[PDB]
Design a protein around this nucleic acid. Structure first.
Ligand SMILES: [Mg+2]
Ligand SMILES: [Mg+2]
Ligand SMILES: [Mg+2]
Ligand SMILES: [Mg+2]
Ligand SMILES: [Mg+2]
Ligand SMILES: [Mg+2]
Ligand SMILES: [Mg+2]
Ligand SMILES: [Mg+2]
Ligand SMILES: [Mg+2]
Ligand SMILES: [Mg+2]
Ligand SMILES: [Mg+2]
Ligand SMILES: [Mg+2]
Ligand SMILES: [Mg+2]
Ligand SMILES: [Mg+2]
Ligand SMILES: [Mg+2]
Ligand SMILES: [Mg+2]
Ligand SMILES: [Mg+2]
Ligand SMILES: [Mg+2]
Ligand SMILES: [Mg+2]
Ligand SMILES: [Mg+2]
Ligand SMILES: [Mg+2]
Ligand SMILES: [Mg+2]
Ligand SMILES: [Mg+2]
Ligand SMILES: [Mg+2]
Ligand SMILES: [Mg+2]
Ligand SMILES: [Mg+2]
Ligand SMILES: [Mg+2]
Ligand SMILES: [Mg+2]
Ligand SMILES: [Mg+2]
Ligand SMILES: [Mg+2]
Ligand SMILES: [Mg+2]
Ligand SMILES: [Mg+2]
Ligand SMILES: [Mg+2]
Ligand SMILES: [Mg+2]
Ligand SMILES: [Mg+2]
Ligand SMILES: [Mg+2]
Ligand SMILES: [Mg+2]
Ligand SMILES: [Mg+2]
Ligand SMILES: [Zn+2]
Lengths: 138, 83, 104, 208, 124
RNA sequence: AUGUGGACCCGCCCCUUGGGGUGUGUCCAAAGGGCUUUGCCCGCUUCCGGAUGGGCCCGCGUCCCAUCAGCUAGUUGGUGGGGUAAUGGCCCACCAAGGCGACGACGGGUAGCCGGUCUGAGAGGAUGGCCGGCCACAGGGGCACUGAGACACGGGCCCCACUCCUACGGGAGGCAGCAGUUAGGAAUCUUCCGCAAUGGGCGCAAGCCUGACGGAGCGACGCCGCUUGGAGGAAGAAGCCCUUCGGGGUGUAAACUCCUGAACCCGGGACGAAACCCCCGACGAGGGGACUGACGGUACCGGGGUAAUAGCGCCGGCCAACUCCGUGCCAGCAGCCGCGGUAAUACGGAGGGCGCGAGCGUUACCCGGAUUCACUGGGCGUAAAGGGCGUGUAGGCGGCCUGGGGCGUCCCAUGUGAA
């Protein structure tokens, strides 16, 4: 049993990209899917897809990196530089709308879940809604 | 009873009063019921008296009693002018 | 508004009176996490109507005694001795915490 | 003055001409020319690599001495320019330049700010018409700064507004040499001040 | 520590031990000398440091340093003390205010006059 | 006696805890005074409402010690009394055996609480001093009387401790009101003026009372404004200080030339004050009139007019500012690091320099830098830190899908958030 499945997906991604994998299977939950939706919209992933490993259902996540650099260590810049859980089990984090944080003067996002559904910060802000601050990504 | 009186607010040799409603038993500068005007006895500005006859008339109707120079000021703003 | 609380009857042991246990979540002022926290009310039960385990709304009211300042307003969910048992073990524990132990 | 004492010895410490003593500072006699090193016994020696603190100190001294203000008075302005909306650097310089004692020296009523201080403390100056003898008085825009009526023909303000015939006055001030009036049009645009002082450093000093 | 931990146990605030029980933690206590003495410094110093044991109004008997070139303190002098370690003499935590009460000023000093307690000498 | 009306028992209706009607019965009122005297003014009585003030109850918040872990017998609840304006073990009798605690009971320590203050980038930390609000207290401990209200600071009773009176029996006191004295202490003010203003009590009013208050007084205790001068003035006095013996420093500083004119003198001289009151009108609205200033001959205005106090700290690094002499691990300095053992920019003095300036230093305390109790914001292989190991109680935490509820969470409106 994963104690925090969301943290795990965020991590599975973090770990996958640092070795520049092509893709990574996370075991599948509606919620997780709803988050990748955002990642894919904002362009941190090339997109996700509901494969089906070994009997049970996953979300193959297709990753994205920069162009090959030059010098020593060509390895590309990461698109997902950084991706952290904010609220966690046993210390939940809920901002109201006046306190949704601004990630990197907007160069990054913060996914939060609201009663109008899973949204970025700019989205919640427009929609006039706060909620459980899920994570930040930049 | 509840009074309508002056509350001293300026500074040493710089008197400004707040015209106030309050139970007669407060200190003169303590917690009051409602400010309903102000008075600068030096007329240091064009705007040295100010009342709000509506509220002044309200408190009179429930039997606030104004001190002798509060009523003088109230009259001077035509609280009592009935014509 | 007279305050209205909802709770579990955890004591019948009195004449015309029930102990009612009332929880309340809330986020911790400094450290964030949501903390449970509970308090027992003595409530006025003049029909000795409500029984151990019943879940009752309790209402603010004019004093009946020391301690008794609430009356049992209505019955929400009848019977559920889990809560009573939960609460019951908590006081069972108490026995341990002292100066000795063993079989005590 | 407020400092009161050897003036061109500060000229030499800051290493810049400061023009505190009026018109002799234009003559080939101001010490800055043909004696440009600091005061004191060691003033002509190999000067050590000055610390980061030293440089921010001196630039503040450089500014404060040029205006003849104290320091408690100086700090109280900077802090007011801090709390004030806008660029706190050049909001400072505007307040400084709004001091009546300085505005009088800008309108060339006196050859220096110190001589301009005395004319104010001695009631030789009107603002909008009534006497103001407070050198710290803040000139606001719209205000008209006259020579005092019964002063107008002292031996000094005669020969000083005579020098101001044909001379030019800062962009932010008018001036009328006939009746000896002058107006404060606008707080100075930072460009208007030719101030030999990187006020960016002065902000940096008051934040240790 | 986990949040649940920090919720259960606290953090733990601190505690400034007062390096000078001038009991009343006032800024000066008056006291009477009981011993004038001389003390050896420590570590890599040598000299003869002047020192009085003082019995205080704060009900305390403590040892104070006697700052200055020379002093005038005897086994019954009444003195004002003021706090201030002497790095060399362990257990000397307070100074004696020179120029107050039985402790004379400091005979003929031109420089740091406020400390040591001597008036502005007269001159044209 | 009158009964508008109200109170109480019983009933009935509507409400819904003791709210509002209604019937019978019972019970319950009052005070006179003044006149510009038949009809006004000031009072009195009952009831209903308003306004102001308050009692009581509840949710939630409020420091340290667990080297305080168990506590409780009016204890917890019931019935019925008592008591009160009123709920209540508030108190009493009887009955049941409850109540409380690891979400910290009981005990100990410390503390008036808040608006706010200080610090901080913030989150935090610290604090409750002036002013404002609540509470409590009036030599210490009880208590009730009077009353709308008190269990009453300048009211009453008793007990205790002091001081005073005392004819030895007995009495009189209570500045934590304003001043003031003494004691303690590092340290904290005048036995001042005035009721002119504002406010309070009584009076129809005139007025009286008001150490509330409005002022003045002392202390650089804080803040703020201001002065000890301005312009000119040498290749650059004198003394003092260096020196490579040429020079260099203090230094435009002084002297000195001119200019202004703090102090001081003379003259005028306030605002704060227009009401109460009297007249007209009508004792209303409205108009007219008169009286009144502690501060004070002060503020300010005008006329004269003198070049008129500068101090304190620091100069090894951190930290702006270096030279000579004296001193010899001494005398001394010292926030920390460290100076001084005969060439000391660190001691003592001198010259010079730096920083502030009617102030500058010191001590003390608070927050800060201190992500050095880390929520923001830290750690534990060897730096301090994994429990010797397990078991598994409380508790914390919990996989994927659907539905209901809507506690947490979020949103809008609104009330509150006094000064
Ligand atoms: Mg040695
Ligand atoms: Mg040594
Ligand atoms: Mg020294
Ligand atoms: Mg009768
Ligand atoms: Mg106390
Ligand atoms: Mg911090
Ligand atoms: Mg006493
Ligand atoms: Mg008593
Ligand atoms: Mg009465
Ligand atoms: Mg009574
Ligand atoms: Mg009394
Ligand atoms: Mg009392
Ligand atoms: Mg008394
Ligand atoms: Mg007194
Ligand atoms: Mg004494
Ligand atoms: Mg006083
Ligand atoms: Mg009066
Ligand atoms: Mg007073
Ligand atoms: Mg007038
Ligand atoms: Mg009068
Ligand atoms: Mg240096
Ligand atoms: Mg030597
Ligand atoms: Mg030296
Ligand atoms: Mg030193
Ligand atoms: Mg000053
Ligand atoms: Mg901290
Ligand atoms: Mg520490
Ligand atoms: Mg942390
Ligand atoms: Mg650490
Ligand atoms: Mg080891
Ligand atoms: Mg170790
Ligand atoms: Mg182990
Ligand atoms: Mg071990
Ligand atoms: Mg479990
Ligand atoms: Mg779940
Ligand atoms: Mg659970
Ligand atoms: Mg909800
Ligand atoms: Mg609100
Ligand atoms: Zn010059």
């Amino acid at each position: 049993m994963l104690t925090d499945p969301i943290a795990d997906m965020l991590t599975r991604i973090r770990n996958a990209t640092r070795v520049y994998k092509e893709s990574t299977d996370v075991p599948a939950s509606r919620f997780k899917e709803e988050i990748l939706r955002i990642l894919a919209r904002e362009g941190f992933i090339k997109g996700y897809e509901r494969v089906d490993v070994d009997g049970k259902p996953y979300l193959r996540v297709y990753l994205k990196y920069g162009p090959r650099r030059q010098g020593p260590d060509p390895r590309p810049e990461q698109v997902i530089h950084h991706i952290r859980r904010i609220s966690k089990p046993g210390r939940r984090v809920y901002v109201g709308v006046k306190e949704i944080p601004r990630v990197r003067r907007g160069l990054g996002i913060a996914i939060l879940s609201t009663s109008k559904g899973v949204l970025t910060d700019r989205e919640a802000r427009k929609l006039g809604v706060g909620g459980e601050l899920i994570c930040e990504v930049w | 009873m509840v009074k309508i009186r002056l509350a001293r607010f300026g500074s040493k040799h710089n008197p400004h009063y707040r015209i106030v409603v309050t139970d007669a038993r407060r200190k003169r500068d303590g917690k009051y019921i409602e400010k309903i005007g102000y008075y600068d006895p030096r007329k240091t500005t064009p705007d040295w008296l100010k009342v709000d006859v509506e509220r002044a008339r309200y408190w009179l109707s429930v039997g606030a009693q104004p001190t002798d120079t509060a009523r003088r000021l109230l009259r001077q703003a035509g609280v009592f002018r009935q014509e | 508004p007279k305050k209205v609380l909802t709770g579990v009857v955890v004591s019948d042991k009195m004449q015309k009176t029930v102990t009612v246990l009332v929880e309340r979540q809330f986020p911790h002022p400094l450290y964030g996490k949501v903390i449970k926290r509970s308090k027992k009310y003595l409530a006025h039960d003049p029909e000795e109507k409500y029984k151990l385990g019943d879940v009752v709304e309790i209402i603010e009211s004019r004093p009946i005694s020391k301690r008794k300042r609430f009356r049992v307003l209505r019955l929400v969910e009848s019977g559920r001795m889990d809560l009573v048992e939960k609460y019951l073990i908590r006081r069972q524990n108490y026995e341990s915490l002292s100066k000795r132990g063993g079989k005590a | 003055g407020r400092y009161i004492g050897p003036v061109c010895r500060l000229c030499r410490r800051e290493g810049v001409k400061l023009y505190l003593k009026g018109e002799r500072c234009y003559s080939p006699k101001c010490a800055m020319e043909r004696r440009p090193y600091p005061p004191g016994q060691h003033g002509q020696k190999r000067a050590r690599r000055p610390s980061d603190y030293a440089v921010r100190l001196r630039e503040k001294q450089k500014l404060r001495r040029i205006y003849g203000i104290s320091e408690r008075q100086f700090r109280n302005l900077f802090e007011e320019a801090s709390k004030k909306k806008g660029v706190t650097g050049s909001v400072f310089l505007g307040l400084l330049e709004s001091r009546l004692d300085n505005v009088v020296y800008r309108l060339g009523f006196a050859v220096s700010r110190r001589q301009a201080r005395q004319l104010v403390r001695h009631g030789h100056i009107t603002v909008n018409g009534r006497r103001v003898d407070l050198p710290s008085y803040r000139v606001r825009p719209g205000d008209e700064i006259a020579v005092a009526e019964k002063s107008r023909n002292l031996e000094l303000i005669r020969q000083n507004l005579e020098a101001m015939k044909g001379r030019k006055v800062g962009p932010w001030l008018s001036l009328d040499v006939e009746g000896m009036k002058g107006k404060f049009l606008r707080l100075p645009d930072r460009e208007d001040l030719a101030l030999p002082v990187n006020e960016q450093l002065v902000i940096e000093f008051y934040s240790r | 520590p986990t949040i649940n931990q920090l919720v259960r146990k606290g953090r733990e605030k601190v505690r400034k031990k007062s390096k000078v029980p001038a009991l009343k933690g006032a800024p000066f206590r008056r006291g009477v000398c009981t011993v004038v003495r001389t003390v050896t410094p420590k570590k890599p110093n040598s000299a003869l440091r002047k020192v009085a044991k003082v019995r205080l109004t704060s009900g305390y008997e403590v040892t104070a340093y006697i700052p200055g070139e020379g002093h005038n303190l005897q086994e019954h002098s009444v003195v004002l003390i003021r706090g201030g370690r002497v790095k060399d003499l362990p257990g000397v935590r307070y100074h004696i205010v020179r120029g107050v009460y039985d402790a004379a000023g400091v005979k003929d000093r031109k420089k740091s006059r406020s400390k040591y307690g001597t008036k502005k000498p007269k001159e044209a």
